[PDB]
Motif scaffolding. Structure first.
Motif, PDB file in Angstrom:
ATOM      1  N   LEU A 115       4.736  12.545  -4.194  1.00 49.19           N
ATOM      2  CA  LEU A 115       4.232  11.457  -5.037  1.00 49.19           C
ATOM      3  C   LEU A 115       4.615  11.657  -6.497  1.00 49.19           C
ATOM      4  O   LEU A 115       3.773  11.671  -7.397  1.00 49.19           O
ATOM      5  CB  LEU A 115       2.726  11.305  -4.886  1.00 49.19           C
ATOM      6  N   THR A 116       5.906  11.843  -6.745  1.00 45.00           N
ATOM      7  CA  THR A 116       6.462  11.965  -8.084  1.00 45.00           C
ATOM      8  C   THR A 116       7.030  10.621  -8.523  1.00 45.00           C
ATOM      9  O   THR A 116       7.775   9.980  -7.773  1.00 45.00           O
ATOM     10  CB  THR A 116       7.550  13.037  -8.116  1.00 45.00           C
ATOM     11  N   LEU A 117       6.662  10.194  -9.732  1.00 43.48           N
ATOM     12  CA  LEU A 117       7.000   8.846 -10.175  1.00 43.48           C
ATOM     13  C   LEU A 117       8.515   8.656 -10.250  1.00 43.48           C
ATOM     14  O   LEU A 117       9.052   7.637  -9.799  1.00 43.48           O
ATOM     15  CB  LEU A 117       6.362   8.566 -11.534  1.00 43.48           C
ATOM     16  N   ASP A 118       9.218   9.619 -10.835  1.00 45.21           N
ATOM     17  CA  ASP A 118      10.657   9.491 -11.029  1.00 45.21           C
ATOM     18  C   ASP A 118      11.385   9.747  -9.716  1.00 45.21           C
ATOM     19  O   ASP A 118      11.290  10.854  -9.173  1.00 45.21           O
ATOM     20  CB  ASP A 118      11.150  10.468 -12.090  1.00 45.21           C
ATOM     21  N   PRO A 119      12.107   8.765  -9.171  1.00 42.41           N
ATOM     22  CA  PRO A 119      12.804   9.007  -7.897  1.00 42.41           C
ATOM     23  C   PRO A 119      13.798  10.150  -7.968  1.00 42.41           C
ATOM     24  O   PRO A 119      14.071  10.790  -6.943  1.00 42.41           O
ATOM     25  CB  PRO A 119      13.510   7.671  -7.617  1.00 42.41           C
ATOM     26  N   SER A 120      14.354  10.426  -9.146  1.00 42.41           N
ATOM     27  CA  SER A 120      15.315  11.501  -9.293  1.00 42.41           C
ATOM     28  C   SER A 120      14.683  12.882  -9.284  1.00 42.41           C
ATOM     29  O   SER A 120      15.364  13.856  -8.952  1.00 42.41           O
ATOM     30  CB  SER A 120      16.070  11.352 -10.620  1.00 42.41           C
ATOM     31  N   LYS A 121      13.400  12.974  -9.614  1.00 45.69           N
ATOM     32  CA  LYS A 121      12.648  14.216  -9.571  1.00 45.69           C
ATOM     33  C   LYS A 121      11.816  14.345  -8.305  1.00 45.69           C
ATOM     34  O   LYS A 121      11.274  15.424  -8.043  1.00 45.69           O
ATOM     35  CB  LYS A 121      11.750  14.305 -10.810  1.00 45.69           C
ATOM     36  N   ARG A 122      11.699  13.270  -7.529  1.00 44.79           N
ATOM     37  CA  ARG A 122      10.955  13.295  -6.279  1.00 44.79           C
ATOM     38  C   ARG A 122      11.704  14.119  -5.238  1.00 44.79           C
ATOM     39  O   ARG A 122      12.931  14.054  -5.131  1.00 44.79           O
ATOM     40  CB  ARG A 122      10.739  11.866  -5.789  1.00 44.79           C
ATOM     41  N   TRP A 147       0.821  -1.205   0.000  1.00 48.19           N
ATOM     42  CA  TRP A 147       0.000   0.000   0.000  1.00 48.19           C
ATOM     43  C   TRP A 147       0.859   1.261   0.000  1.00 48.19           C
ATOM     44  O   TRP A 147       0.471   2.280  -0.585  1.00 48.19           O
ATOM     45  CB  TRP A 147      -0.927   0.024   1.213  1.00 48.19           C
ATOM     46  N   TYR A 148       2.025   1.212   0.648  1.00 48.58           N
ATOM     47  CA  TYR A 148       2.933   2.350   0.724  1.00 48.58           C
ATOM     48  C   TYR A 148       4.194   2.141  -0.108  1.00 48.58           C
ATOM     49  O   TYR A 148       5.160   2.895   0.047  1.00 48.58           O
ATOM     50  CB  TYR A 148       3.312   2.651   2.182  1.00 48.58           C
ATOM     51  N   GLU A 162       9.019   2.494  -8.017  1.00 49.89           N
ATOM     52  CA  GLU A 162      10.296   1.900  -8.387  1.00 49.89           C
ATOM     53  C   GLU A 162      10.411   0.470  -7.871  1.00 49.89           C
ATOM     54  O   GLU A 162      10.830  -0.433  -8.605  1.00 49.89           O
ATOM     55  CB  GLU A 162      11.437   2.780  -7.863  1.00 49.89           C
ATOM     56  N   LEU A 163      10.037   0.243  -6.609  1.00 54.15           N
ATOM     57  CA  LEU A 163      10.069  -1.111  -6.064  1.00 54.15           C
ATOM     58  C   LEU A 163       9.092  -2.030  -6.779  1.00 54.15           C
ATOM     59  O   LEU A 163       9.364  -3.226  -6.933  1.00 54.15           O
ATOM     60  CB  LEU A 163       9.768  -1.084  -4.572  1.00 54.15           C
ATOM     61  N   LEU A 164       7.955  -1.495  -7.226  1.00 54.74           N
ATOM     62  CA  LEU A 164       7.027  -2.307  -8.001  1.00 54.74           C
ATOM     63  C   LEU A 164       7.680  -2.754  -9.296  1.00 54.74           C
ATOM     64  O   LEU A 164       7.473  -3.883  -9.756  1.00 54.74           O
ATOM     65  CB  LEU A 164       5.758  -1.516  -8.293  1.00 54.74           C
ATOM     66  N   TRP A 177       8.161   8.617  -0.730  1.00 58.16           N
ATOM     67  CA  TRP A 177       6.901   8.243  -1.363  1.00 58.16           C
ATOM     68  C   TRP A 177       5.897   7.748  -0.329  1.00 58.16           C
ATOM     69  O   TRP A 177       4.734   8.167  -0.321  1.00 58.16           O
ATOM     70  CB  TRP A 177       7.146   7.174  -2.428  1.00 58.16           C
ATOM     71  N   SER A 178       6.334   6.852   0.557  1.00 57.34           N
ATOM     72  CA  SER A 178       5.444   6.343   1.593  1.00 57.34           C
ATOM     73  C   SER A 178       4.929   7.470   2.481  1.00 57.34           C
ATOM     74  O   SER A 178       3.741   7.507   2.824  1.00 57.34           O
ATOM     75  CB  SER A 178       6.167   5.287   2.430  1.00 57.34           C
ATOM     76  N   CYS A 179       5.807   8.400   2.862  1.00 60.55           N
ATOM     77  CA  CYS A 179       5.379   9.501   3.717  1.00 60.55           C
ATOM     78  C   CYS A 179       4.393  10.410   3.000  1.00 60.55           C
ATOM     79  O   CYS A 179       3.493  10.971   3.635  1.00 60.55           O
ATOM     80  CB  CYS A 179       6.593  10.304   4.181  1.00 60.55           C
ATOM     81  N   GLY A 180       4.539  10.565   1.683  1.00 60.83           N
ATOM     82  CA  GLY A 180       3.536  11.288   0.923  1.00 60.83           C
ATOM     83  C   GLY A 180       2.204  10.564   0.912  1.00 60.83           C
ATOM     84  O   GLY A 180       1.142  11.192   0.978  1.00 60.83           O
ATOM     85  N   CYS A 181       2.242   9.232   0.824  1.00 60.56           N
ATOM     86  CA  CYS A 181       1.019   8.449   0.949  1.00 60.56           C
ATOM     87  C   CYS A 181       0.355   8.689   2.297  1.00 60.56           C
ATOM     88  O   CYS A 181      -0.875   8.768   2.386  1.00 60.56           O
ATOM     89  CB  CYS A 181       1.332   6.966   0.757  1.00 60.56           C
TER      90      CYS A 181
END
Ligand SMILES: Cc1cccc(Nc2nc(CC(=O)Nc3ncc(C)s3)cs2)n1
Lengths: 826, 248, 327
Positions: free
Chosen positions: C287-294, C186-187, C191-193, C206-210
């Motif tokens: 919640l930005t898809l690209d980890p480098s832009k997150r 859920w969190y 990238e891990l997916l 990402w998780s903290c944004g969730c």
């Protein structure tokens, strides 16, 4: 795994909403009454109501509105369930055959949204162009009512005002217009928007925002002759329409909050208003016609008509007849007269419809020694408070004992041929510095009376200021005769002392039978009470004697007798007290791993504890040691509203999300952890709020009763008056009835085309799980009401297990007999 | 808060091993053999240099609280390497450490692991954790050798020669009780100092303070030459005692 | 001394009850007999003797004795069962990791639905989490299991991070295969997916944004049971993974394998329109898809939403009361 069976013994009785219109025919005047999950359809006559049809829906009815779009001969019905199942319904009758048509349906739930504080609101445009829904903060959902929208597809319009109190479509506008009251940090305001289906957004509304009363509660939409809207508050009623502004603030309404309104005259001249104290008002719109020929609102007037039951919904029918829909008390038909009676009232009751009201507590007692058992329920609130004695005899016989005050708890004491009942009444700070009751009630009309003189908390030195007009609760223990149900004695507890628990039992080696009450000292300043009492009373020779008192540092939420000892829950602590030869309570042992021990239940040396949120706990009393041992806990966090022990291994709990669940010991001794882990093996969305679980049955037992497949009997009472029953099954019987349910769901047509599997799915704002371990007995019992072609269609390719024939085919006649036996448990 | 893991040289005269009649030379040899056993076993398994050093540090600290006569060193060494792998996120299965320990040890030596080698090692984990006071995080001279070398600017080839020679001295110091006497930051400086003397390099020229003759003071505060010389003496003693000579 | 862990016996604590089923053992509430302080005890059992002391516990002992922060939980000491006397081989007694007892865990408050979070309360909550995460990330440690259950809070309003069992150090210079799918589905970050295996500290962000969105919606944002299903839900709100928004998405093992139904457009601002503007911008960046832009943790702390929040005013949340227990 565990296998259980749940059935309704009494359907929900509280009125959640009611509307009028032309639903069954364009000619008849209809009254549709909505009870939780139940829709009742009536036709209005000159004497009263003629029932015509009742349907159940697989959902709690949240919205119910009649409308007639251009091209239809008669009104259509919109219903939205609390799980967001929407549908449009039509009444169709073919001679003697009555059925309900699902014209459109779909689920309007959004993936991302915050449920609003004031709940789901649903309104329909006067031109029947769209359905407006307020489901989430900051969003307004529009279902356009075009002919092609058979799936009820919808879009959201961003709404800047996040906290909306109430909204209505306005009458007399060039475009669909909404008028609503909203709250932001600067107070409450009234504002308008125009709704554009073409652009799919709001446009500037017809008139400007106005600041309104801080507690502005309801929006009344005024019809075309006047136009505009009326805003109802706590102190004032105001009319708004562009440049026109009126305000009447009559002192009579400040006394009690107004909760319901309806329009008597289609032109808007007269509206009805009801308040929490049961008073019924008439709101009058005084017209002034100008030489221009235009009609303007001159002034507003409020006139007191009389008293009704505390009503969730009012609907004026015809002539002088009004239907009063009551959730906290019995509903009514009343007639409004032009001439007042000799007491000054214009309201005279015609009929009274039984409402079991909120069932706060209940007990089963065989009063007549019949082996049957009768259910005495604490029902209603405030003026509608009552004790209801219910017996089976094919309908249920119900007796009503008026109390005119709220009944909190009940417990039966056979030795004294009487009941002990905890009650509370509302008094208001008066000019004397004391308080005055708004009406006489059970605690004030007792034959003999007493007041606690306890000095435990008398040291005080803690200031609690009082303002004239503020309400207080005054708590009492009522001693009520089991035959006459006459209040024999009333004991009033300390000022600011709330009674939370009641038992009747003998303790230790003491031969006397006592009434024992657990209390909490409640002060507005404290979030959680830090003071309380356990009080031992003896009822003897018409008088209640205080035998002993034990001071505690918290609220005694729940008490239960434990093998000659007293088990009491004080806030987090669960404590076991012994009763000494000096007639005083002495602490033996404590358990403390509970957020708040709201509920307690005992079987043997085992205790079931219900935290508010860490679910259920299985404690054990270990006599060799003199202390408690934690056996196992339900680690999924769930709120508890009531618990019960089914057997030594299975435990039943109710969630505040209207969900029921069964926990069991994992019965695997390999690891200590497995045993300490309680596995939720049953999950079931009931749709009702359970307050009290109680072992017992209402069925007559002559000892001749065939042994039913079902084993055990737990009755439960709910907020909406629904009484249900939980019982256990064998694995073989569960599988048979479960496989039958899946077959029945394919055959039976649901109103609104709501999937049964979805309806019973354990659902919280956060989660949704498929039901498990529970048989919807109300579905099984409907097999007897489906037509013969459908019955045979159900039994096709159905096999039993472990019978005379391991695989035994079922016939429609075989299953009819099985269900008919299952109907005999209630 | 945190424990003290540094002792004085004089205190090593009073280890449990010494007081049970073991002489200083024997405990010294027993420590080299255990450390090198840890080094060789883990190298065969492909383990990172930090993982080898961590196991060796656990090993050295262990026998500050226990005697070599009651705890076989090779079992202890294998246990330290087993735990070090988990601490440093380079895990190995205990059976694989035993397999490698058997390959490298003769029959007389593997006799310490008794009838069930894995069990003897796994059981010891309890004592090891308690002995090292659950203080699992360890810093090693390697990170400081590189952190400090990165701040040197000059001839690429002279500094790389300095680093490798110093790196070798770090590996050799793991067989000694220097880990128990001086923080790793000091060890890294001492090996830079030693290599500079041997290669006849003047490191201050490569620093941001080329006229600061005590070049190390900017990396490690409050270190006298007395300490760096004591460390250098102890490192070179190993070479002199052995047939092996300075790498140069 | 205070530092000689592993020797003091668990006799020194009066065990109160069972509060959790952990990973390497059960977790109990307890009271210190000498001071009266309430502590939470995590049991570590080496009796299995499969691989000895659980590495999950070793990580928690290694890392938490290094990390000092108000928003990161404190291991007070490690205590033991009465050990057998002079017979370690027979001794199979367990060890306990002593922690400060934190009154509640987020999910229990959310699952009960009793807790109501004002904007200001959320500000204080997120700021404490971000500050704790920044400390950990600055020390080059990655939580790798950010969950509502793992976020402990006291009735005072102090928030502390807790389950460091899966935590590991991260080196930008040296990228090596890491445990895949560390965070709960859920969190879990996208990238891990897609199976990066060399993930950045941005996974925790990402998780903290969730969590930020869930605090506003009171319902978890991306609830799914399957990895592909999670991607679809994330893709609908955050947009479908595509090379334009994630230039290096093509290098991920499962990019071609795992595909959303459609190339969904980003709708986060539309669907979270009810969220205040200052917070909505934080969510879009978290919640930005690209980890480098997150966004980074520091960047979240230097956001209009959190920068001017004052930690002195902890502002405790609205926690249930007896009146709230009553209906
Ligand atoms: C079923 C049940 C009953 C009672 C409590 C529970 N779990 C609960 N824990 C808490 C608080 C908590 O986790 N505090 C911690 N402090 C230090 C740690 C390492 S963890 C509240 S409710 N479950």
């Amino acid at each position: 795994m565990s296998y259980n069976y749940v059935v309704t013994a009494q359907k929900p009785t509280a009125v959640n909403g009611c509307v009028t219109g032309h639903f069954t025919s364009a000619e008849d005047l209809n009254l549709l009454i909505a009870k939780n999950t139940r829709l009742e359809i009536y036709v209005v006559t000159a004497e009263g109501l003629r029932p015509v049809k009742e349907v159940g829906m697989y959902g709690k009815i949240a919205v119910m509105e009649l409308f007639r779009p251009k091209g239809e001969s008669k009104d259509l019905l919109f219903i939205l369930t609390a799980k967001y199942n929407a549908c449009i319904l039509e009444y169709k009758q073919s001679g003697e055959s009555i059925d309900i048509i699902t014209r459109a349906h779909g689920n309007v739930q959004d993936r991302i949204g915050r449920p609003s504080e004031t709940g789901i609101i649903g309104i329909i445009d006067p031109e029947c162009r769209m359905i407006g829904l307020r489901l989430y903060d900051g969003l307004f959902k529009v279902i356009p009512l075009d002919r092609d929208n058979k799936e009820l597809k919808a879009f959201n319009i961003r709404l800047e005002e996040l906290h909306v109190i109430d909204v209505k479509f306005l009458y007399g506008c060039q475009a669909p217009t909404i008028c609503f009251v909203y709250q932001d940090p600067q107070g409450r305001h009234v504002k308008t928007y125009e709704v554009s289906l073409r652009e799919k957004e709001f446009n500037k509304g017809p008139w400007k925002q106005e600041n309104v009363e801080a507690e502005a509660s309801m929006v009344i939409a005024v019809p075309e002759p006047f136009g505009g809207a009326i805003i109802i508050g706590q102190e004032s009623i105001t009319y708004h329409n562009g440049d026109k502004y009126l305000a009447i603030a009559p002192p009579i309404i400040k006394q009690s909050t107004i909760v319901c309104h309806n329009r008597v005259d289609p032109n808007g001249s007269r509206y009805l208003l009801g308040d929490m104290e049961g008073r019924l008002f008439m709101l009058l719109l005084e017209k002034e016609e100008q030489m221009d020929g235009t009609v303007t609102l001159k002034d507003l007037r409020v006139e007191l008509l009389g008293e009704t039951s505390i009503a969730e919904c009012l609907t004026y029918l015809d002539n002088g007849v009004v239907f009063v829909g009551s959730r906290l008390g019995d509903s009514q038909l009343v007639k409004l007269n032009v001439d007042s009676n000799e007491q000054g009232s214009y309201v005279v009751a015609m009929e009274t419809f039984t409402n079991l009201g909120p069932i706060v507590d209940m007990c089963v007692v065989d009063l007549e020694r019949q082996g049957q058992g009768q259910l005495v329920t604490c029902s209603g609130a405030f003026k509608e408070g009552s004790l209801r004695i219910i017996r089976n005899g094919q309908k249920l016989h119900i007796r009503t004992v008026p109390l005119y005050e709220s009944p909190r708890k009940i417990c039966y004491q056979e030795v004294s041929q009487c009941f002990g009942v905890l009650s509370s009444r509302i008094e208001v700070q008066d000019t004397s510095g004391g308080t005055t009751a708004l009406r006489p009630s059970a605690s004030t009309q007792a034959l003999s009376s007493s007041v606690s003189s306890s000095k435990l908390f008398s040291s005080s030195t803690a200031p609690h200021e009082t303002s004239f007009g503020e309400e207080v609760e005054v708590h009492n223990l009522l001693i009520i005769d089991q035959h006459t149900f006459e209040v024999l004695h009333a004991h009033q507890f300390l000022q600011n002392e709330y009674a939370l628990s009641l038992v009747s039992c003998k303790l230790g080696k003491d031969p006397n039978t006592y009434f024992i009450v657990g209390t909490a000292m409640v002060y507005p300043e404290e979030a959680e009470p830090k003071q309380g009492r356990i009080v031992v009373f003896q009822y003897s020779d018409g008088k209640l004697q205080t035998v002993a008192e034990k001071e505690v540092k918290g609220a005694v939420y729940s008490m239960v007798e434990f093998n000659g000892k007293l088990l009491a829950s004080i806030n987090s602590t669960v404590r076991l007290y012994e009763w000494t030869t000096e007639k005083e309570l002495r602490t033996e042992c404590n358990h403390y791993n509970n957020i708040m021990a709201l509920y307690l239940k005992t079987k043997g040396d085992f205790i079931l504890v219900g935290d508010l949120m860490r679910s259920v706990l299985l404690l054990a009393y270990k006599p060799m040691e003199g202390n408690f041992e934690e056996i196992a806990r339900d680690f999924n966090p769930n709120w508890m509203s009531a618990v019960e022990i089914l057997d030594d291994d299975n435990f039943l709990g109710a969630e505040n999300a209207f969900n029921l669940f069964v926990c069991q010991k994992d019965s695997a001794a390999t690891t200590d952890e497995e045993r300490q882990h309680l596995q939720e093996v049953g999950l079931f969305h009931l749709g009702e709020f359970v307050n009290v679980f109680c072992h017992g049955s209402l069925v007559m037992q002559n000892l001749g009763e065939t042994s039913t497949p079902t084993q055990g009997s737990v009755l439960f009472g709910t907020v909406n008056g629904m009484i249900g029953l939980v019982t256990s099954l064998s694995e073989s019987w569960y599988n048979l009835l479960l496989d039958m349910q899946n077959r029945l769901n394919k055959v039976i047509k649901s109103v609104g085309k709501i999937e049964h599997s979805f309806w019973r799915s354990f659902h919280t704002e956060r989660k949704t799980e498929p039901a498990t371990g529970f048989i919807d007995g109300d579905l099984i019992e409907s097999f007897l009401d489906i037509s013969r072609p459908k019955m045979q269609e159900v039994v096709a390719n159905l096999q039993y297990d472990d019978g005379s024939g391991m695989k035994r085919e079922a016939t429609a006649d075989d299953l009819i007999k099985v269900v008919e036996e299952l109907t005999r448990i209630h | 808060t945190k424990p003290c893991w540094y002792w004085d040289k004089k205190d090593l005269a009073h280890t449990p091993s010494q007081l049970e009649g073991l002489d200083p030379a024997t405990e010294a040899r027993y420590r080299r053999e255990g450390a090198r056993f840890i080094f060789d076993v883990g190298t065969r398994l492909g383990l990172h240099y930090d993982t080898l050093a961590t196991g060796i540090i656990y090993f050295h600290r262990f026998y500050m609280f226990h005697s070599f006569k009651q705890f076989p060193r090779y079992v202890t060494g294998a246990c330290c390497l087993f735990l070090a792998g988990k601490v440093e996120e380079t895990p190995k299965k205990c059976k694989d450490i035993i397999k490698t320990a058997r390959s490298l040890l003769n029959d007389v030596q593997f006799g310490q692991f008794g009838d069930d080698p894995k069990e003897e090692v796994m059981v010891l984990e309890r004592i090891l954790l308690q002995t090292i006071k659950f203080d699992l995080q360890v810093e090693h001279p390697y990170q400081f050798l590189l952190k400090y070398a990165k701040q040197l600017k000059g001839d690429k080839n002279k500094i790389q020669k300095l680093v490798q020679m110093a790196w070798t001295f770090v590996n050799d110091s793991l067989c000694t009780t220097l880990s128990l006497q001086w923080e790793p930051e000091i060890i890294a400086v001492a090996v830079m100092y030693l290599a500079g003397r041997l290669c006849k390099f003047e490191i201050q020229e490569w620093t941001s303070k080329p006229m600061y003759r005590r070049w190390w003071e900017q990396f490690v505060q409050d270190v006298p030459v007395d300490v760096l010389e004591d460390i250098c003496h102890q490192i070179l003693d190993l070479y002199s005692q052995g047939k092996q000579q300075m790498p140069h | 001394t205070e530092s000689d862990w592993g020797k003091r016996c668990v006799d020194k604590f009066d065990i109160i009850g069972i509060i959790g089923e952990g990973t390497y053992g059960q977790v109990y509430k307890a009271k210190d007999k000498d001071t009266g302080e309430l502590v939470a005890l995590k049991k570590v059992r080496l009796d299995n003797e499969k691989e000895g002391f659980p590495i999950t516990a070793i990580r928690e002992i290694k890392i938490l004795r290094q990390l000092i922060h108000r928003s990161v939980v404190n291991m007070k000491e490690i205590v033991t069962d009465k050990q057998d006397a002079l017979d370690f081989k027979k001794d199979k007694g367990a060890f306990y990791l002593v922690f400060e007892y934190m009154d509640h865990d987020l999910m229990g408050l959310l699952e009960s639905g009793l807790v109501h979070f004002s904007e200001d309360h959320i500000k204080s909550f997120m700021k404490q989490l971000m500050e704790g995460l920044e400390y950990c990330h600055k020390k080059n440690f990655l939580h790798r299991d950010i969950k509502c259950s793992n976020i402990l809070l006291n009735n005072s309003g102090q928030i502390k991070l807790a389950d460091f069992g899966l935590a590991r150090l991260y080196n930008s210079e040296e990228s090596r295969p890491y445990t895949n799918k560390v965070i709960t589905l859920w969190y879990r970050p996208p990238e891990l997916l897609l199976g990066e295996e060399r993930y950045t500290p941005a996974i925790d962000v990402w998780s903290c944004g969730c969590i930020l969105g869930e605090l506003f919606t009171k319902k978890p944002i991306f609830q799914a049971n399957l990895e592909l299903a999670q991607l679809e839900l994330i893709s609908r709100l955050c947009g479908s993974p595509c090379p334009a928004v994630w230039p290096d998405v093509i290098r991920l093992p499962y990019f071609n394998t795992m595909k959303p139904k459609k190339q969904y457009r980003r709708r986060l601002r539309e669907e979270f329109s009810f969220i205040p503007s200052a917070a909505l911008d934080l969510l879009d960046h978290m919640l930005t898809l690209d980890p480098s832009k997150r966004c980074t943790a520091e960047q979240t702390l230097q956001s209009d939403f959190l920068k001017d929040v004052e930690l002195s005013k902890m502002a405790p949340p609205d926690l249930p009361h007896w009146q709230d227990c009553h209906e």
